[PDB]
Structure 1
Amino acid sequence: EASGQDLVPAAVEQAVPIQPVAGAALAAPAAGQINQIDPWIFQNFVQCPLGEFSISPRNTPGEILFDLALGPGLNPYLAHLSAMYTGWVGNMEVQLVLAGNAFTAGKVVVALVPPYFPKGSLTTAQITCFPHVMCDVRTLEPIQLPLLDVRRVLWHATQDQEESMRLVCMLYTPLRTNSPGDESFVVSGRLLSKPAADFNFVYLTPPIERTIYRMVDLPVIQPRLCTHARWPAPVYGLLVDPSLPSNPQWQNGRVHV
């Protein structure tokens, strides 16, 4: 154990009011192929692609911290297996590691928003009406919580089309610090996740190249060797400078991600 216990160790999955949900037992007789995912993925948690967030004292109440939707894009495995198969089912288990310094305060709320809910505002008045959980930003252990799969079709397709049970949290009451000197402890978060008892993919298709869950690869070449995009000349050094205009509209070297 740590030292000491002027923190608040929520180790229990809080009771969310939502029935169990059947996973790949509604897609077995309607996906003409047997499939299983390596039984050593179900064993250890692992950080999602979107894993990190920060709760800084400037964040007002109501700012959605992490709004992550159930799907194969919640593991590095399940998002790298899901380039072969076409479609998934089933539940998932998400951890939430927010263990801020013992001199902080303020609470967040996590709400299992169902499908077919209009994305957008989701203000701090209608984040508690969903089946939610409130947890303090001092919690020591990881706070497990489920991510069931509420749906009306048997198995979703593996293109981003479908709508699934998002799991959005919200900075309920702001983070304010207490230490007597010139510092507020930005609490960094993490997000680990593993497929539930009966997550499963359905039909086995060729691992197409330009698939949808390529994370990102930035080219492994030094900025010293790259070429500038505004003058036919090499790059000679990168730097940060507030003195120069910090909102230009250069019409060269301007590509989206």
Structure 2
Amino acid sequence: SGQDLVPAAVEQAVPIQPVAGAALAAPAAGQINQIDPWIFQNFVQCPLGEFSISPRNTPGEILFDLALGPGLNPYLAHLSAMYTGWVGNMEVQLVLAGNAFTAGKVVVALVPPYFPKGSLTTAQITCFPHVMCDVRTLEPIQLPLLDVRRVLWHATQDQEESMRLVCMLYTPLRTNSPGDESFVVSGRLLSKPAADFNFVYLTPP
């Protein structure tokens, strides 16, 4: 177990203040709905939480872009068939455990609602609350994805403007290996609801 990596993926400060979850949507919903408490314990992989970084990728290549919601959890995506509504923050891990020979850096940003989708150049991704992380960090980089909004809750009809989470490839991936091989790093993505996630109204699945 060599420690020539960068395990310096400790909790960094992201310039964002805490956000209310289910406390505001309680007096406008119609009933008391809580979800299973063992769901909040373990990090599980997103339904779209696998990607890879090849050395044939140029800086600016969006590794993943995903909106906050129940589509980031296999347990929440199954429960979101019975409800019409959700509020709360979620917590995401980032498993970039590349080989001891690679080199490179990705930057995970926190894009607000109502930002125009699409290009999102690499010069304008550091303008958001971001986390700049290497591709060798052993421990899974935890980071919060918050529910910034201007309504009381979101319907489970994906057309709502929700906060995104963009992962640009800030610098190109290179390998320093003595011969013939350039390792491809396979990144995974785990998530779990924060303490204030909750669904709103019971409807037939």
Q: Shorter-chain TM-score category?
A: over 0.9
Contact 1:106 1:173 in 2 (8 A): yes
The CA deviation at 1:13 is 2.5
Aligned to 1:205: 203
Partner deviation per Cα, 1:109-164 (whole Å, 9 max, x = no partner): 01001000000100100000001010001111100000001100000001111111
In structure 1, C-alpha distance between the alignment counterparts of 2:11 and 2:45, rounded to whole Å: 19
SS in 2 for 1:194: strand
SS in 1 for 2:52: strand
In structure 1, C-alpha distance between the alignment counterparts of 2:58 and 2:130, rounded to whole Å: 20
The CA deviation at 1:23 is 0.3
In structure 2, C-alpha distance between the alignment counterparts of 1:69 and 1:120, rounded to whole Å: 14
TM-score of the pair, normalised by structure 1: 0.79
CA RMSD of aligned residues (A): 0.6
Q: How many residues align?
A: 205
The CA deviation at 1:12 is 1.8
In structure 2, C-alpha distance between the alignment counterparts of 1:23 and 1:10, rounded to whole Å: 30
In structure 1, C-alpha distance between the alignment counterparts of 2:157 and 2:141, rounded to whole Å: 30
Contact 2:43 2:191 in 1 (8 A): yes
Partner deviation per Cα, 1:228-253 (whole Å, 9 max, x = no partner): xxxxxxxxxxxxxxxxxxxxxxxxxx
- Higher-RCO chain (CA-CA 8 Å, sequence separation at least 6): 2
Q: Percent of pairs identical after alignment?
A: 100
SS in 2 for 1:125: helix
Choose 1 or 2 for highest CA Rg. Answer: 1
Partner deviation per Cα, 1:182-240 (whole Å, 9 max, x = no partner): 11010000000000011000000000xxxxxxxxxxxxxxxxxxxxxxxxxxxxxxxxx
The CA deviation at 1:68 is 1.0
In structure 2, C-alpha distance between the alignment counterparts of 1:43 and 1:105, rounded to whole Å: 33
Contact 2:9 2:133 in 1 (8 A): no
Partner deviation per Cα, 1:20-54 (whole Å, 9 max, x = no partner): 00000010000011001100000000000001010
In structure 1, C-alpha distance between the alignment counterparts of 2:136 and 2:14, rounded to whole Å: 21
User: Which protein is richer in strand relative to its size?
Assistant: 2
The CA deviation at 1:181 is 1.0
Contact 2:88 2:147 in 1 (8 A): yes
The CA deviation at 1:11 is 4.0
The CA deviation at 1:79 is 0.4
Unaligned runs of 5+ in 2: none
SS in 2 for 1:48: strand
The CA deviation at 1:7 is 0.3
